[PDB]
Amino acid sequence: MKSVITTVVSAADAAGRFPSNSDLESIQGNIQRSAARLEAAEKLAGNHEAVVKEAGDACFAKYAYLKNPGEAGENQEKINKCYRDVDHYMRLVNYCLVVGGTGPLDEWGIAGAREVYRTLNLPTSAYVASIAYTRDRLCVPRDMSAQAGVEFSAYLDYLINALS
Amino acid sequence: MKSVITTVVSAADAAGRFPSNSDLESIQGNIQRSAARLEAAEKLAGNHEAVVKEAGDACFAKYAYLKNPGEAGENQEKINKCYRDVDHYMRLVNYCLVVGGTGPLDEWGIAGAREVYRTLNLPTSAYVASIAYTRDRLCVPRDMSAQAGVEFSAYLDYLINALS
Amino acid sequence: MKSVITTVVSAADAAGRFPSNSDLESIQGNIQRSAARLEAAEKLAGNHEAVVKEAGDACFAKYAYLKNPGEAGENQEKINKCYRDVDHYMRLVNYCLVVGGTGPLDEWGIAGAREVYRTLNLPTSAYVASIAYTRDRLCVPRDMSAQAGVEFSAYLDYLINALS
Amino acid sequence: MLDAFSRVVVNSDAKAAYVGGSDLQALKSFIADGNKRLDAVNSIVSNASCMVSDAVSGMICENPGLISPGGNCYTNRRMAACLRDGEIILRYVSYALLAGDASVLEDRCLNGLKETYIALGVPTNSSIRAVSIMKAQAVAFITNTATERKMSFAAGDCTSLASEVASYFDRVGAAIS
Amino acid sequence: MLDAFSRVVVNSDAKAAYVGGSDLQALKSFIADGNKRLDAVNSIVSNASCMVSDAVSGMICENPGLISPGGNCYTNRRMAACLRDGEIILRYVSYALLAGDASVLEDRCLNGLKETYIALGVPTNSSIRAVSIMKAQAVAFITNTATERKMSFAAGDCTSLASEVASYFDRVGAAIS
Amino acid sequence: MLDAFSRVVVNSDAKAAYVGGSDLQALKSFIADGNKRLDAVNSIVSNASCMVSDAVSGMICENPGLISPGGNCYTNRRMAACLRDGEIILRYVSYALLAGDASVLEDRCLNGLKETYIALGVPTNSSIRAVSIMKAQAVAFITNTATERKMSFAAGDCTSLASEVASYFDRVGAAIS
Numbered sequence A, B, C: 001m002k003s004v005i006t007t008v009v010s011a012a013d014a015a016g017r018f019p020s021n022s023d024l025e026s027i028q029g030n031i032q033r034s035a036a037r038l039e040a041a042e043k044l045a046g047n048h049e050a051v052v053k054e055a056g057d058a059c060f061a062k063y064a065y066l067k068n069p070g071e072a073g074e075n076q077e078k079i080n081k082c083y084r085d086v087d088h089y090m091r092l093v094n095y096c097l098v099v100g101g102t103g104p105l106d107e108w109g110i111a112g113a114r115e116v117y118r119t120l121n122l123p124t125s126a127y128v129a130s131i132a133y134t135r136d137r138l139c140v141p142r143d144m145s146a147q148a149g150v151e152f153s154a155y156l157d158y159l160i161n162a163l164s
Numbered sequence D, E, F: 001m002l003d004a005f006s007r008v009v010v011n012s013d014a015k016a017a018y019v020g021g022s023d024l025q026a027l028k029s030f031i032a033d034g035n036k037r038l039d040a041v042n043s044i045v046s047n048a049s050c051m052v053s054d055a056v057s058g059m060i061c062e063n064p065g066l067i068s069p070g071g072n073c074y075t076n077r078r079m080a081a082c083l084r085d086g087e088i089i090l091r092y093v094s095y096a097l098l099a100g101d102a103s104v105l106e107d108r109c110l111n112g113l114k115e116t117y118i119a120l121g122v123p124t125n126s127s128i129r130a131v132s133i134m135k136a137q138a139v140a141f142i143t144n145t146a147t148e149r150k151m152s153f154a155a156g157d158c159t160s161l162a163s164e165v166a167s168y169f170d171r172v173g174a175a176i177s
């Protein structure tokens, strides 16, 4: 699972090496940056339902065609799956903030996504609309501190770029 | 086993592909050419004993030295194995006509033959004499139709070339 | 185990070949050279204790620092291991003379030695001093014949070069 | 791999027998019905994407635990692998129908698959339900009785070809049960 | 591989749960004690050569049969392999301590090791004694109580880190027993 | 691989013993009879093609079912593989006789061969008969008593070398039984 620690350990293992000074120094970065991203994770954990509702509503507001027969959001069950999927992503964003790397998004949300969404005829723009809405809705310092904002926004942009 | 169908399927599988139009069109060739080669197969099935006798007799007529002590046809047992071998080949020719490809010759008659005939000191020319006799003995339209003849002759030439 | 026989057999096997004339001729060299090296092996077998004592004494005579605290020969147990190690080498030299190749040295004495002696902080010069002492102590024809001497000396030089 | 013709050849060769008139009636009919076989394969390949999508979705809407955490389709990576296996199995079933013989399916797809799914934790019972749905779809397309799509054919009886493709789909569950 | 943080993530994901304040107190402390963890890893890596040397030598002086003929450390090639395995195990134990999780050790080192040592004839009981000696050494270095070397630290309690590294060394014997 | 000399070395090394006069009488004789060993190997290699041909043909004329359909020598591909295995086994038996030790045969040829022949359906009993015929041939050539060919030698007793090659041929059947 990609983080600061697992990157430096994997590199040391590929080379047969004990941890050395640049590995310990990398991990010192954990200690320095952790407060910002853990602030974002806690805010997200505490308010994800309202965030997810706003983001799914923005998707369908932007793409009303999704509710037409044969389209991805043609009935209520399918609509509810769409908000569930947004929640899944927001949960993975919380996990990336906690881990300090993209690993949980990469493994559990991005790997295979292109094939899934193409095969099930789920338009990638609808996902992008939800995540970009959330990125642009973020209000600093109303919702969290500037650096918690930078951390939260970076994983949202990472997902948007992964979908694009 | 090499045929029209197995060639196109193997190619599609190597590429990860479903059957597509050029595969179905190749197999349409089956439908078109099958009457000729099935005519040859039935004629061969119905008369193989007389054909095999003529071909083995031609071998020994051409190569009387084979009956000398120490040579490949030095006794009756060995002579009978030689006509059996010709029959084996004619059976494989019948199978190629039925399958519409060289697979049964390639797998059951040609693979390993060089090593066998070299190790057991069986001269390749004696086999060639039998098969070429049979190719040249074919009488069209006495024995079968022109295109049944082309099919039958093509597998005999294929074997001769495989031995040469 | 590297010898005349195993070299030519391994080569023949790599090529899929039966033994042929150059293999039998190589092995004729066994028959010719064996008396010299078997003379050396028997002399060594018969006198190894005195040889080993002289060689270990020469090590410590040359490198008295080895007996200082923290150094490789700091106590009697460690000193006794050093003479044991010299004996091990002399035993492997006897085995090379018997086999007619470096195999027993290569497998049981040289492979891994660098890592062992570096990790256990055993100075390679101390080993070299013991083996070179023994090479230079050899007295021909007092101790054995000239060609037994050449054989014995060649394996001692081989070990010295392997340590250097 | 074998096809309908080389299957006969193999069976004859086990008796050192020539294939003659008495043996060929089945293969002459195989040829005479060969345009129908081509159409049946076209009817599947032309709808293959919708078939796999709809079958795997059907497996899940019937057993929604498969997409709970710990479920074998949970995460995009897993769902993509599942969809990927659905397409592979349909592909090998389509080769068996084109060839008139199961050997390509058994040899190149089914051999080892049970042990693999056991090793990975892939639920073989949910796999069999995805395959049964694709069976249902394939029979519908071959007989031009799908509810949501019709294709173009000279009218005739394709019962045998539908029964045959069903048998190749049934082989998958037999292998992995 | 996982680290202390992604371990929590995995456990939360099994319940489809966000990681929130209530879940983070342990990880906030992991961070707050992170300089001590770095020092503990430094204290091991800086003495790793002497640790492996002394542990394998200790295994042998306690069981000198290991260096008789037929013994599993007899010959330089064998002794070098043994020393090589000692260093590998210490390396993986040091990664587990840096990451605050055993997964790298279990996955990349311990998985398959029993079967390997059984296949090769490597005595698993002598292996466990070498590992126990390195455990003893590692706890001494982490707590700055080694008899023959002290290092430099701001004074404080590293009990937990020593208990934790001990647990990773204990995993090795558990795996190979 | 080992040869006669390094076999002794291995046995001595298991006792941490030097090889001395008392131990060398057998190897001094090995040397003193070394021209005979070279001749015995020449007598086999010079007739190896006829040996393998005649032995595999003999296996089949005694059990003609092997060349019926379903028989393990049926088809040229199978007969060529069989002849190929005959030559390989004779080759490894010839290396064992050149080296005065079976290790090359056991290690590089016999190890795994039973499991292989079981996996492939190669009849191990017919294999043993081919090997017994090559044994009969090899003893005849080594002692210059073959009926159909004599070679050139200074006269002397090669009983031991014939008994020894017989023992290496007997190892093959022991391995595959």
Ligand SMILES: *C(=C)C1=C(C)[C@@H](Cc2[nH]c(/C=C3N=C(/C=C4\NC(=O)[C@H](C)[C@H]4[C@@H](*)C)C(C)=C\3CCC(=O)O)c(CCC(=O)O)c2C)NC1=O
Pocket (backbone or CB within 6 Å): D047, D050, D051, D054, D055, D057, D058, D059, D061, D062, D132, D133, D136, D137, D138, D140, D141, D145, D146, D147, D148, D149
């Ligand atoms: C979950 C709510 C759920 C499903 C998803 C669905 C799965 C399902 N589908 C069938 C039967 C068929 N599906 C077909 C597929 C297609 N028809 C088309 O026209 C397009 C090209 C393609 C993809 C949509 C077809 C042809 C059938 C055959 C029947 C028919 O044509 O009506 C089943 C039935 C399976 C069975 O009979 O065992 C199932 C379960 N069902 C859901 O509940």
Ligand SMILES: *C(=C)C1=C(C)[C@@H](Cc2[nH]c(/C=C3N=C(/C=C4\NC(=O)[C@H](C)[C@H]4[C@@H](*)C)C(C)=C\3CCC(=O)O)c(CCC(=O)O)c2C)NC1=O
Pocket (backbone or CB within 6 Å): E047, E050, E051, E054, E055, E057, E058, E059, E061, E062, E132, E133, E136, E137, E138, E140, E141, E145, E146, E147, E148, E149
């Ligand atoms: C054979 C005669 C034999 C040994 C060899 C030795 C093995 C052994 N060692 C310990 C304990 C430690 N070894 C340590 C290693 C080092 N200390 C250093 O300063 C350098 C850098 C490094 C290598 C020499 C350390 C730190 C310890 C911990 C205790 C301490 O500091 O005093 C043991 C004890 C193992 C146990 O407790 O189970 C053993 C057996 N002992 C011998 O008998």
Ligand SMILES: *C(=C)C1=C(C)[C@@H](Cc2[nH]c(/C=C3N=C(/C=C4\NC(=O)[C@H](C)[C@H]4[C@@H](*)C)C(C)=C\3CCC(=O)O)c(CCC(=O)O)c2C)NC1=O
Pocket (backbone or CB within 6 Å): F047, F050, F051, F054, F055, F057, F058, F059, F061, F062, F132, F133, F136, F137, F138, F140, F141, F145, F146, F147, F148, F149
């Ligand atoms: C089938 C009808 C059938 C056979 C084929 C044959 C097989 C067979 N062969 C032997 C014994 C030997 N074969 C030898 C081979 C050769 N001699 C030569 O001079 C050339 C160079 C070479 C190849 C032809 C040899 C040397 C012998 C040893 C005996 C001898 O020299 O006479 C046996 C006997 C095996 C046994 O004793 O168990 C068999 C079965 N026999 C057939 O029935």
Ligand SMILES: *[C@@H](C)[C@H]1/C(=C/C2=NC(=C\c3[nH]c(C[C@H]4NC(=O)C(C=C)=C4C)c(C)c3CCC(=O)O)/C(CCC(=O)O)=C2C)NC(=O)[C@@H]1C
Pocket (backbone or CB within 6 Å): B021, B024, B025, B028, D032, D033, D034, D035, D036, D037, D038, D039, D040, D042, D142, D143, D144, D153, D154, D155, D156, D157, D158, D161
């Ligand atoms: C069950 C499978 C179908 C059905 C099939 C029939 N197809 C018939 C005739 C036919 N089909 C094709 C197309 C096919 N041949 C090819 O070469 C290729 C591509 C390379 C394909 C896809 C052809 C050429 C023909 C021959 C007649 C023509 O030229 O149109 C058919 C008629 C009987 C017969 O010819 O055997 C049938 C019954 N029909 C059905 O109703 C179900 C749905």
Ligand SMILES: *[C@@H](C)[C@H]1/C(=C/C2=NC(=C\c3[nH]c(C[C@H]4NC(=O)C(C=C)=C4C)c(C)c3CCC(=O)O)/C(CCC(=O)O)=C2C)NC(=O)[C@@H]1C
Pocket (backbone or CB within 6 Å): A021, A024, A025, A028, E032, E033, E034, E035, E036, E037, E038, E039, E040, E042, E142, E143, E144, E153, E154, E155, E156, E157, E158, E161
């Ligand atoms: C048990 C492990 C030790 C012990 C450890 C403590 N270390 C403490 C503070 C401290 N240590 C370092 C070095 C560390 N941080 C790094 O960034 C790197 C290399 C990249 C390393 C090796 C630092 C920077 C600090 C912070 C204080 C400072 O700047 O000096 C410490 C104090 C408590 C705390 O800060 O958590 C302790 C207890 N102390 C012991 O006595 C045992 C032997």
Ligand SMILES: *[C@@H](C)[C@H]1/C(=C/C2=NC(=C\c3[nH]c(C[C@H]4NC(=O)C(C=C)=C4C)c(C)c3CCC(=O)O)/C(CCC(=O)O)=C2C)NC(=O)[C@@H]1C
Pocket (backbone or CB within 6 Å): C021, C024, C025, C028, F032, F033, F034, F035, F036, F037, F038, F039, F040, F042, F142, F143, F144, F153, F154, F155, F156, F157, F158, F161
């Ligand atoms: C049983 C194996 C034989 C038999 C063998 C004997 N060979 C004897 C002497 C001898 N043979 C060779 C040829 C050999 N040495 C080589 O260097 C090479 C090729 C590199 C080969 C093939 C040589 C050189 C010698 C030495 C005498 C000479 O120069 O002619 C031999 C005599 C006794 C002995 O020297 O040990 C025997 C008994 N004799 C038999 O009758 C059976 C059939």
Ligand SMILES: *[C@H](C)[C@H]1/C(=C/C2=NC(=C\c3[nH]c(C[C@H]4NC(=O)C(C=C)=C4C)c(C)c3CCC(=O)O)/C(CCC(=O)O)=C2C)NC(=O)[C@@H]1C
Pocket (backbone or CB within 6 Å): A043, A044, A047, A050, A051, A054, A134, A137, A138, A139, A140, A142, A143
């Ligand atoms: C920002 C520069 C604007 C501003 C924005 C407003 N946000 C409003 C409500 C609100 N925002 C969110 C999402 C937000 N909360 C979170 O916890 C997270 C991430 C963890 C995010 C992105 C939600 C769910 C809500 C509704 C609940 C609530 O009130 O907090 C808001 C209220 C009016 C509206 O709904 O449009 C505004 C105006 N407010 C500002 O003053 C600056 C200019």
Ligand SMILES: *[C@H](C)[C@H]1/C(=C/C2=NC(=C\c3[nH]c(C[C@H]4NC(=O)C(C=C)=C4C)c(C)c3CCC(=O)O)/C(CCC(=O)O)=C2C)NC(=O)[C@@H]1C
Pocket (backbone or CB within 6 Å): B043, B044, B047, B050, B051, B054, B134, B137, B138, B139, B140, B142, B143
């Ligand atoms: C051809 C251009 C000549 C001609 C040739 C004749 N063929 C004669 C008999 C015959 N041919 C075969 C082999 C043939 N029959 C088959 O079934 C097959 C392949 C399936 C082949 C190649 C056999 C076995 C026989 C003998 C039995 C029989 O009579 O059919 C033949 C009879 C006289 C002779 O034996 O030489 C001739 C003259 N005949 C022609 O009119 C044109 C010029």
Ligand SMILES: *[C@H](C)[C@H]1/C(=C/C2=NC(=C\c3[nH]c(C[C@H]4NC(=O)C(C=C)=C4C)c(C)c3CCC(=O)O)/C(CCC(=O)O)=C2C)NC(=O)[C@@H]1C
Pocket (backbone or CB within 6 Å): C043, C044, C047, C050, C051, C054, C134, C137, C138, C139, C140, C142, C143
């Ligand atoms: C040689 C050119 C000198 C010479 C040298 C002397 N060697 C003396 C004793 C001796 N040498 C060895 C080692 C030797 N014996 C072996 O068996 C082997 C290898 C298998 C070797 C290398 C030993 C163990 C001994 C002591 C036992 C013994 O006397 O044989 C020696 C005696 C005096 C001394 O110890 O320095 C000398 C003088 N002697 C010569 O005449 C030429 C000039």
Ligand SMILES: *[C@H](C)[C@H]1/C(=C/C2=NC(=C\c3[nH]c(C[C@H]4NC(=O)C(C=C)=C4C)c(C)c3CCC(=O)O)/C(CCC(=O)O)=C2C)NC(=O)[C@@H]1C
Pocket (backbone or CB within 6 Å): D056, D066, D071, D072, D073, D077, D078, D079, D081, D082, D083, D085, D086, D088, D089, D108, D109, D113, D116, D120, D122, D123, D124, D126, D127, D130
């Ligand atoms: C979908 C209906 C299933 C399901 C399927 C999964 N399969 C997974 C992995 C997988 N599948 C195969 C076999 C496949 N590969 C082949 O090459 C061939 C034939 C040529 C076939 C049939 C392999 C070898 C693998 C492993 C390698 C890989 O992942 O591609 C899989 C991933 C398992 C995992 O989490 O690691 C899944 C989810 N899962 C289901 O729940 C339904 C029943």
Ligand SMILES: *[C@H](C)[C@H]1/C(=C/C2=NC(=C\c3[nH]c(C[C@H]4NC(=O)C(C=C)=C4C)c(C)c3CCC(=O)O)/C(CCC(=O)O)=C2C)NC(=O)[C@@H]1C
Pocket (backbone or CB within 6 Å): C059, C066, C072, C073, C074, C077, C078, C079, C081, C082, C083, C085, C086, C088, C089, C092, C108, C109, C116, C120, C122, C123, C126, C127, C130, E057, E060, E067, E073, E074, E075, E076, E079
């Ligand atoms: C003598 C010139 C040295 C010296 C040697 C010591 N060797 C110690 C241990 C040791 N030696 C070997 C190599 C030896 N073992 C073999 O199996 C073979 C095969 C040919 C040889 C040459 C090994 C593998 C080991 C480690 C295992 C063991 O203890 O036997 C040793 C103990 C070192 C320690 O425990 O720290 C010493 C002191 N001593 C000297 O003063 C000079 C440099």
Ligand SMILES: *[C@H](C)[C@H]1/C(=C/C2=NC(=C\c3[nH]c(C[C@H]4NC(=O)C(C=C)=C4C)c(C)c3CCC(=O)O)/C(CCC(=O)O)=C2C)NC(=O)[C@@H]1C
Pocket (backbone or CB within 6 Å): E056, E066, E071, E072, E073, E077, E078, E079, E081, E082, E083, E085, E086, E088, E089, E108, E109, E113, E116, E120, E122, E123, E124, E126, E127, E130
């Ligand atoms: C030392 C405390 C032991 C001892 C160890 C030996 N290990 C030998 C070989 C060996 N070890 C491993 C596992 C190692 N390689 C890895 O890549 C990893 C993790 C990534 C580990 C832990 C392997 C695969 C092998 C075999 C390949 C090789 O030799 O490197 C070994 C040699 C056995 C032999 O004689 O062939 C020894 C002696 N032996 C002992 O007596 C103590 C208890």
Ligand SMILES: *[C@H](C)[C@H]1/C(=C/C2=NC(=C\c3[nH]c(C[C@H]4NC(=O)C(C=C)=C4C)c(C)c3CCC(=O)O)/C(CCC(=O)O)=C2C)NC(=O)[C@@H]1C
Pocket (backbone or CB within 6 Å): B059, B066, B072, B073, B074, B077, B078, B079, B081, B082, B083, B085, B086, B088, B089, B092, B108, B109, B116, B120, B122, B123, B126, B127, B130, F057, F060, F067, F073, F074, F075, F076, F079
């Ligand atoms: C006829 C033109 C030859 C001749 C032939 C002999 N063949 C002998 C043995 C033999 N033949 C084959 C090939 C055959 N077996 C198959 O399974 C197939 C498949 C198409 C074919 C063509 C093999 C594999 C063997 C060896 C096994 C066996 O004996 O059946 C044979 C016996 C040789 C011997 O024992 O030394 C003979 C005499 N004889 C002739 O005069 C001409 C050259």
Ligand SMILES: *[C@H](C)[C@H]1/C(=C/C2=NC(=C\c3[nH]c(C[C@H]4NC(=O)C(C=C)=C4C)c(C)c3CCC(=O)O)/C(CCC(=O)O)=C2C)NC(=O)[C@@H]1C
Pocket (backbone or CB within 6 Å): F056, F066, F071, F072, F073, F077, F078, F079, F081, F082, F083, F085, F086, F088, F089, F108, F109, F113, F116, F120, F122, F123, F124, F126, F127, F130
């Ligand atoms: C002949 C006396 C037998 C017989 C033999 C067959 N062996 C077949 C295949 C085969 N043999 C081996 C082992 C061989 N290869 C090696 O590299 C070594 C030693 C280094 C040896 C001894 C292998 C690995 C294989 C399979 C690969 C291959 O075909 O080469 C074989 C073909 C089996 C098949 O049909 O696929 C046969 C017929 N068969 C007999 O009936 C007599 C008893």
